[PDB]
Amino acid sequence: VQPNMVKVLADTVVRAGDLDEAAAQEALKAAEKALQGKGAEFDYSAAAARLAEAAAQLR
């Protein structure tokens, strides 16, 4: 509230420490990656050029 304005910013679900933590823990469990890897991924250009050409050749 301000002298000439009243703003109500509601919430879509009932927040709480359990529900808020549970959704995060369920997202760790959902990150089901048998082999984690490294993230270096040097094949970026080799894949990006192939798909760039395939997406262009379609038009």
Partner 1 sequence: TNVISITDGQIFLESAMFNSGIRPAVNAGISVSRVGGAAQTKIIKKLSGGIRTALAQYRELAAFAQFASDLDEATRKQLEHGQRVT
Partner 2 sequence: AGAKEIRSKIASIKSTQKITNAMEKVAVSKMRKAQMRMAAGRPYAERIRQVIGHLANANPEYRHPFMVEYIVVSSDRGLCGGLNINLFKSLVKDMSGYREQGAEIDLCVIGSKGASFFRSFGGNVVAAISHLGEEPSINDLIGSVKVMLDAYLEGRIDRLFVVSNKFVNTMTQKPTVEQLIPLHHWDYLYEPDAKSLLDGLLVRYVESQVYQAVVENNACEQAARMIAMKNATDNAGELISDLQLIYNKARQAAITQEISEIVGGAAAV
Partner 3 sequence: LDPLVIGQDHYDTARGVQYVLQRYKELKDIIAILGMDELSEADKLLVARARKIQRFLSQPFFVAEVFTGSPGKYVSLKDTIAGFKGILNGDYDHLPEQAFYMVGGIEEAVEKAKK
The reply to whether 52 sits near partner 1 by the rule CB under 8 A is: yes
Buried b (16+ CB within 10 A) or exposed e, 31-57: eeeeeeeeeeeeeeeeeeeeeeeeeee
- Terminal alpha carbon distance of the chain: 54
Pick the closer one to partner 1 by CB: 22 or 52: 52
18 touches partner 2 (CB under 8 A): no
| Residues in touch with partner 2 (CB under 8 A) | 2, 7, 9, 11-13, 20-21, 23-24, 26-28, 30-31, 33, 35-39, 41, 43-44, 47-48, 51-52, 55, 58-59
